[PDB]
Write an enzyme that holds these catalytic residues in place. Sequence first.
Site, mmCIF file in Angstrom:
data_model
loop_
_atom_site.group_PDB
_atom_site.id
_atom_site.type_symbol
_atom_site.label_atom_id
_atom_site.label_comp_id
_atom_site.label_asym_id
_atom_site.label_seq_id
_atom_site.Cartn_x
_atom_site.Cartn_y
_atom_site.Cartn_z
ATOM 1 N N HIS A 1 9.293 4.558 0.194
ATOM 2 C CA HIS A 1 8.056 3.820 -0.158
ATOM 3 C C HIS A 1 8.454 2.993 -1.472
ATOM 4 C CE1 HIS A 1 5.001 5.761 2.168
ATOM 5 N NE2 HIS A 1 5.673 6.755 2.017
ATOM 6 N N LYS B 1 -5.430 -3.540 -7.976
ATOM 7 C CA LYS B 1 -4.218 -2.630 -7.775
ATOM 8 C C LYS B 1 -3.673 -2.136 -9.115
ATOM 9 C CE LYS B 1 -2.296 -6.506 -5.807
ATOM 10 N NZ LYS B 1 -1.790 -6.094 -4.702
ATOM 11 N N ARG B 2 -2.877 -1.304 -9.136
ATOM 12 C CA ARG B 2 -2.293 -0.692 -10.133
ATOM 13 C C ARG B 2 -1.650 -2.039 -11.246
ATOM 14 N NH1 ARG B 2 -1.823 4.969 -10.945
ATOM 15 N NH2 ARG B 2 -0.827 4.270 -12.901
ATOM 16 N N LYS C 1 3.972 -6.584 -10.003
ATOM 17 C CA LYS C 1 2.653 -7.023 -9.255
ATOM 18 C C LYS C 1 1.981 -8.316 -9.815
ATOM 19 C CE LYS C 1 1.390 -2.392 -7.937
ATOM 20 N NZ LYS C 1 1.269 -2.652 -6.372
ATOM 21 N N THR D 1 -0.930 -2.401 0.786
ATOM 22 C CA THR D 1 -1.999 -1.811 1.688
ATOM 23 C C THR D 1 -3.418 -2.660 1.368
ATOM 24 O OG1 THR D 1 -2.391 -0.202 0.726
ATOM 25 C CG2 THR D 1 -0.841 -0.053 2.629
ATOM 26 N N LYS E 1 -6.556 -4.730 3.440
ATOM 27 C CA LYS E 1 -7.976 -4.328 3.355
ATOM 28 C C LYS E 1 -8.845 -5.940 3.201
ATOM 29 C CE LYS E 1 -6.843 -0.207 1.151
ATOM 30 N NZ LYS E 1 -6.655 0.322 -0.271
#
Lengths: 810, 810
Positions: free
Chosen positions: B351, B542-543, B548, B650, B654
């Site tokens: 991952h 998201k975190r 990111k 992910t 969504k």
Amino acid sequence: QISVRGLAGVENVTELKKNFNRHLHFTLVKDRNVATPRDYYFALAHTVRDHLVGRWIRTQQHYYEKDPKRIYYLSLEFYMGRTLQNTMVNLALENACDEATYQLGLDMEELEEIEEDAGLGNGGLGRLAACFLDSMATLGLAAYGYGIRYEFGIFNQKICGGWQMEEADDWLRYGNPWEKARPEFTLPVHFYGRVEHTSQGAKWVDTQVVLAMPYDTPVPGYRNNVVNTMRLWSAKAPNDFNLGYIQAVLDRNLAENISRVLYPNDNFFEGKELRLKQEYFVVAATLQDIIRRFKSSTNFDAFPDKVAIQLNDTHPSLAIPELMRVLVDLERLDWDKAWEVTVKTCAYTNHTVLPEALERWPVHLLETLLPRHLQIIYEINQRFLNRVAAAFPGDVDRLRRMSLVEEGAVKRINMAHLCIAGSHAVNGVARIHSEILKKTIFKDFYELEPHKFQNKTNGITPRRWLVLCNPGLAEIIAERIGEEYISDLDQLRKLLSYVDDEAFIRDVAKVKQENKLKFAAYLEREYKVHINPNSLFDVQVKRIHEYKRQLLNCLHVITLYNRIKKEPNKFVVPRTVMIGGKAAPGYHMAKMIIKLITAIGDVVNHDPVVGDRLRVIFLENYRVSLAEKVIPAADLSEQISTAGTEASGTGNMKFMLNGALTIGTMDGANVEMAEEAGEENFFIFGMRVEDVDRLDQRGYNAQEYYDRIPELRQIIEQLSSGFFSPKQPDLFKDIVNMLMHHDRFKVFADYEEYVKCQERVSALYKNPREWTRMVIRNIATSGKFSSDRTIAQYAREIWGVEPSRQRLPA
Amino acid sequence: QISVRGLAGVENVTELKKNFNRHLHFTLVKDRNVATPRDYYFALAHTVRDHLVGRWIRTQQHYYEKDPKRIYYLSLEFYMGRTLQNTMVNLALENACDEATYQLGLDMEELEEIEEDAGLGNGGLGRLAACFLDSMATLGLAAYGYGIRYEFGIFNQKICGGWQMEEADDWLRYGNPWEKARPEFTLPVHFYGRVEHTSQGAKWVDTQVVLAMPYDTPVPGYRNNVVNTMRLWSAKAPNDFNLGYIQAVLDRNLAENISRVLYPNDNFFEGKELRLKQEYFVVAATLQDIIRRFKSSTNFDAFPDKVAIQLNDTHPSLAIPELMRVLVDLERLDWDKAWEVTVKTCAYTNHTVLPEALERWPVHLLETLLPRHLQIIYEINQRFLNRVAAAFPGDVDRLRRMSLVEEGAVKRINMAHLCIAGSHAVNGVARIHSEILKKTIFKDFYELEPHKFQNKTNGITPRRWLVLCNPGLAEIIAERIGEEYISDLDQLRKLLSYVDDEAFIRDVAKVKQENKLKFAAYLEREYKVHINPNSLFDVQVKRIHEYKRQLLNCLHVITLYNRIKKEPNKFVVPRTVMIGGKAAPGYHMAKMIIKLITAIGDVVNHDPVVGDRLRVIFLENYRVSLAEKVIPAADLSEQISTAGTEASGTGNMKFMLNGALTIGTMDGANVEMAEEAGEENFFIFGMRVEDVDRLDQRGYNAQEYYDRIPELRQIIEQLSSGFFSPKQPDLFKDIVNMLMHHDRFKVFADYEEYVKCQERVSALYKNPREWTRMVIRNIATSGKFSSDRTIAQYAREIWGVEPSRQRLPA
Ligand SMILES: O=C1NC(c2ccc3ccccc3c2)=N[C@@]12O[C@H](CO)[C@@H](O)[C@H](O)[C@H]2O
Ligand SMILES: O=C1NC(c2ccc3ccccc3c2)=N[C@@]12O[C@H](CO)[C@@H](O)[C@H](O)[C@H]2O
Ligand SMILES: O=C1NC(c2ccc3ccccc3c2)=N[C@@]12O[C@H](CO)[C@@H](O)[C@H](O)[C@H]2O
Ligand SMILES: O=C1NC(c2ccc3ccccc3c2)=N[C@@]12O[C@H](CO)[C@@H](O)[C@H](O)[C@H]2O
Ligand SMILES: *Cc1c(COP(=O)(O)O)cnc(C)c1O
Ligand SMILES: *Cc1c(COP(=O)(O)O)cnc(C)c1O
């Protein structure tokens, strides 16, 4: 099967069975192909607790509507034992459940044995709390027990190589079906901080918060549809607590440690911080609850009309300065008014004689942990000492002796002194003990406030301690005199008219014999050891303590052994001597006594010449559930504390009720027991309190007894020389040295009269019919020692409430 | 109300109501006069869990009879969220319960909001585990999730003065009605000790024991009557543990700390002992269970026919040496055979891209804690390196690079290397990521064993992530194409034929608008802040992580702000920019980014000239239940990781499912999403992986972008000068310094193309009809991203089992 176990109606049994299968499925998530006895016990427990629910809700509802005066029993210990059978007894479900389980192919007695004891107590004090709750519910009092839900109760005792080892009592591992968590009624409790004085009065600031989360356990009365509450507090850290990240979360354990473990000392004060935290925690959280409930009926004059708080020894003595703190600092009552309210609300039961059991907290501990409470305590002291000076002017010594503050290298607060000052009533727990409180340790207080001092002789609940543990004896009694005695134990006097009835004599001895057979078999099944059940069952079960003189008993046992060896071919009445009890982990001498007991057993039980004439058994892990088995099986009760040391005792009462004769000193409730039964029907030996005092004045010289009593000298020499410890000759030198030079409890002084009196016991046992007639005289006069009597006296003479035997609606 | 929520039969509703009142009474011990919403939620939860029980028992029974191959999904994280609604959806009870509660005068939606999230995960990895279980149960696989029952999940995030503060997630305070403790299946786990070699082989001795107690949570499949198990282990000390007395009992906490708290790092390895204990604990206890179940069907050839063990990253990599240890040392199989069994049993999902997320355990830790496992690991390494040498003779460098043991000041075990060697399959989690594994970090392994490397593109469960969170969109879809798509999401392609239907266009935009209205009101009720619901909802949840690139988003936001100020009277498409996410507590830079986000908000949201044209909202405590609310409300999904850093993502999926357009880089599953929808129907910007590699070779100079882009320079100067932090001018110097000198994620490189692409988003939003037609094209091609598809591929291509859509009997 038997009548006092209630009806097994066909509807009732059918319903119990379907609910048992519903819980097995939906609650336990098991099918019948994979369930174990433990699952079956859980399914039964849930089925029975269901019958408590309506009764619990309606009871608590009734108390809200009627608003009676509410009794708060604060204790650090509640020694509850198992709940399942007691619930069934009190709801008249026992035979129905027996029948229901029987048709499912299960043995209910076997499922009962799976329940863990709730062992949240050390012994007498904790168990008295449990008997009290039962009697409070049975007598319809709006009563609440408050304490701490310890994660670990009294340790499990293993014997390894004849020594006590301790294991953690993980009583919650499988879940507790009898408790209901109430996390919604969680309350804050404060520690540390400091005190700021303002214009608007004192302020307790910068405190650490621990949360108190209540768990409620139902307390069913006897067949009256009353269900009272036992609320136990658990410690939880607040979520901003300590808030690198990981360590902060792990350190939450520091706060939760407060409710982790019961302190395992019996009549011994250990001045540790964690224990003080436990004491404040139960007090702080309980008083918030009391007050909340009081305010849902700004004026506190009525508080003592609506609230009684009973302190179970000094352990929750901080309730007194806490109630003041709340009334003065939070409610902003003036001091004098707050104090009046506090005194009229609080009452103190003393359970303590021995100086080393009295709580004396160092000031530096209270200073750090509870700074405002110490200010308040000091203020109490000053105002109290001002009244002493006015009543006894010039008696400076009295001032020193009565002070709440003891002077010394370390200053200490005498919590007992705080309780007398702060309570409208102070009672001991047996007449002779209440007399000793007035004549010696609280003489000064008695002379100031004579009206505060009372007696409330202890008792035991005849539900657990007769009906539950000894159904066959309950039954033969109910055959002659009916069922009503179970809630009115004075009715046992009616058995005196059956003392010469041949059939009753036969039934009483039959039940005793069945109890012995059953206990003997229990010893073989669970502990692989072979007792003669025709022998006299000589039993001493209670915590291991020098003042309770297990050692005197050991001396008797070794004497019998030496007599057999001297004259092996003479007849002696066979005995099974059983001694059991836990020692506190740090009490070296109690641990040695256990070891001596097992060492004696290893010699006596393997001597071929002795045969089955003498056996010595140490009963492992003595606890409430073991007491329910061995006490009905006993012939002779050993209550042999040095006069003036056992405040009451309650084991003594359990045995009297269950058909054993007592050999005992005039100590504690032994005095009242003998007075009820008649001295002819009791094996009384040894020094009285007065005799002990005479011996103390001239000086106790153990050597004098050793020089004058050859039988005793022989024993001391065997102990010393390693007769009982071949591989470690000197193993027992600490026992010998103490008995010869430092015996506070004067074991040798009572030795001769004990051995003689034990001979009278043996002689009577030789005559079964007269033994049994004497038993009947004991059972028949045991009525006084019902905790119903005790609680009725507390209610009438301290709390100001009327008990009741009238049933709530079902 | 709506059709996909099932039938509300009159029998069914009547029954739900009576069972709700039974549980309120008997389970919660409340009457209706004192119950709170929380009690009502508990009564409902117990009522619904009752419908799981029969299904759970019969399912587990069926697996025992049929003995299928069993899948074990080992993960340290399961991010479950709330259970109540999901249970009702999967059992077709939602409308019946709605109806039942409605007639009791309660609002079920309000009771749902009382349930705590089970937050036993950090984000994507944990949530993938949860989506997988759902899909395993829906596809009728005999699948078990195994992990740790942490007492504290992911922390609750408070914002105080614009900074993240952490609070302990006390998710168990009020009890978990969805778990069933199984203390009877408690198992030992060993730590420390040492290894003795004998004649009969190696022996692990003098270990410390921790007990592993399982809690089972049911995992219902979608309307097939299958209920699988999630088993989570809790740490308990043995009762002889440390066994003065008090301290020994308190030190039990050291052992229980193992399951106390979830490590809160997202894609970051922290090499702490407690974490390693967590990893061994779940592995040791799980493998004992696997083996026990295998043996109830001495021969292990069939083991891989009856067992698949999937490793969720390296976190349970010790399953490999543990399985060997059991087979070699306890079962006494020879090494080669045991190894074959192990390889055929185990499979590893990677991952992870980022080097600092790869687990590399220091040898000295493994040496102390797991001495036998280290011996076994070394033995694995040697035999593995012997095969490398034979295949690539003379390539000494390859040997160094492929070793399981990394040489250094500290030696480390590369757990990823252990997993590749010890597994028959290794997969990444999106096509581009699986390609990167073969081309860069595991090139050497790929060249040795090409057959082991697969792709399994991630997915999300359309039950939670469409039906549950967005019932109105589910419904309009079910109106046109039926209900079947919920378990066969490819059927959404049928929506392409509705792309020019005016009525469908109207319904899709209506649902979006209702979701926005409802989310806006949620913001006012729970957090007192006023958003324009006609604005475009630009959301990045998201975190918080540098890779990111929340910071890229912040730069866009400040650019829009500066454009408005330069030309205040020009029209711009209004936006509500919402960013949310937790930062790991020790990640200074993630914490600064949160602070910058709130600092931007304080300037932009209080500028009168801006109006309601631009709002910046930091969404506090982003978690599964907040995702269920904000994702249906979003218009634009921000998926803007630097190319090559997001393994899959992910969240992206969504949003696609829920009617938002995506602005994103060609990273992770973004590539496959664009390919499914068509590149014209996606807002793709920025460097590709290849571009990033070119930039790396010539060197990333941030200064070049700052010199060439005035708009960007303006922003850097505002940050530096304290435009966004007036009282602390230099607050954001660490952000500036990193962006200018040490940016591993090349934020400035993507800045220009991002701003341009954001302009294309704004222009399309100006044309509602074409915006919505594009949305339809996205929803309609989102089928591939069902976790049902993912799990079917795992089942067919790794585990060797056939999924099924056939219902068990009810
Ligand atoms: O069994 C008993 N325990 C204690 C006691 C006293 C002080 C303590 C201090 C700290 C901890 C435990 C303590 C226990 N007192 C006892 O109370 C019983 C109930 O009245 C009496 O029957 C016993 O004669 C008396 O010994
Ligand atoms: O664990 C529980 N104990 C009881 C309960 C119910 C009735 C009682 C009656 C008398 C005495 C104790 C009692 C305890 N209810 C429970 O509450 C938990 C918290 O609400 C739920 O999670 C459990 O599923 C539920 O079974
Ligand atoms: O969300 C994710 N977390 C982790 C991850 C990796 C290593 C870790 C090491 C220690 C602790 C947590 C860790 C989490 N990987 C992720 O897995 C998701 C599921 O495949 C992907 O969608 C994400 O792109 C990827 O970032
Ligand atoms: O606390 C409990 N949870 C459950 C339970 C029952 C069915 C379930 C179905 C699905 C998911 C979870 C489930 C949990 N049973 C309980 O078991 C405890 C231990 O046996 C009892 O003390 C509680 O009174 C009882 O309520
Ligand atoms: C009644 C009881 C006691 C108190 O017994 P004494 O002989 O008065 O010390 C102690 N422990 C248990 C388990 C009891 O049931
Ligand atoms: C789906 C989800 C994630 C993963 O989102 P990404 O955008 O892929 O990082 C993280 N947290 C929560 C609460 C989720 O529901």
